[PDB]
Copies of this chain bind each other. A is one copy, B any other.
Amino acid sequence: TGVTAVA
């Protein structure tokens, strides 16, 4: 939800 960036 929203803006999510996960490496």
Contact = CB atoms under 8 A, between A and B. Distances in A.
Interface of A: 1-7
Number of copies of this protein chain within its complex: 10
A1 B5 CA distance: 11
Can you list the 9 inter-chain pairs with the closest CB atoms, starting with the nearest? A5-B5, A3-B5, A2-B2, A4-B4, A1-B1, A7-B7, A6-B6, A3-B3, A3-B7
A4 to B, nearest CB: 5
A3 B3 CA distance: 5
A5 B7 CA distance: 8
Contacts of A6: 3-7
Contacts of A7: 2-3, 6-7
